[PDB]
């Protein structure tokens, strides 16, 4: 498109 | 399109 | 379209 | 109470 | 309470 | 058996 | 048996 | 409380 | 058996 954002993420977090 | 956002996410979180 | 947002997410959360 | 245990868990296991 | 245990866990295991 | 394959897998993928 | 395949899998995918 | 334990964990294990 | 393959895997991929 004109202003594309593609964001892909995956995470393991040990507690917040 | 014009202003596309594609967001894909998957996560494992050890407790909030 | 003009202002598309596509969001896909899947998660495993160890307790809130 | 007096002797509280709160346990929350969620998991993905690739086969036992 | 008096003797609180709070346990939160989430895991991905590649086969047992 | 004779020609055994045992495959166990589990995964978190942040978007394909 | 003779030619056994055992496959076990479980996954979380953040969008295809 | 008096004797609090808070435990939060999350893990990826490549096979046991 | 005779020709055993045992494969165990688990993974977090930040987007393909």
UniProtKB/Swiss-Prot annotation, chains A, B, C, D, E, F, G, H, I:
Where is it located?
A: Secreted
Q: In which tissues is it expressed?
A: Expressed by the dorsal and submental skin glands.
Q: Name one GO cellular component term.
A: extracellular region
Q: Which GO terms describe its biological process?
A: defense response to bacterium
Record key words, sorted: Amidation, Amphibian defense peptide, Antibiotic, Antimicrobial, Secreted
Do you know which InterPro entries this protein is assigned to? Aurein_antimicrobial_peptide
Q: Which cysteines are joined by disulfide bonds?
A: none
The keyword Transcription regulation appears for this protein: no
Residue positions of the PTM Leucine amide?
16
Q: What does this protein do?
A: Bacteriostatic action for Gram-positive bacteria.
Identify this protein by name: Citropin-1.3
Which species is this UniProt entry from? Ranoidea citropa
């Amino acid at each position: 498109g004109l202003f594309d954002i593609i964001k892909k993420v995956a995470s393991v977090i040990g507690g917040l």
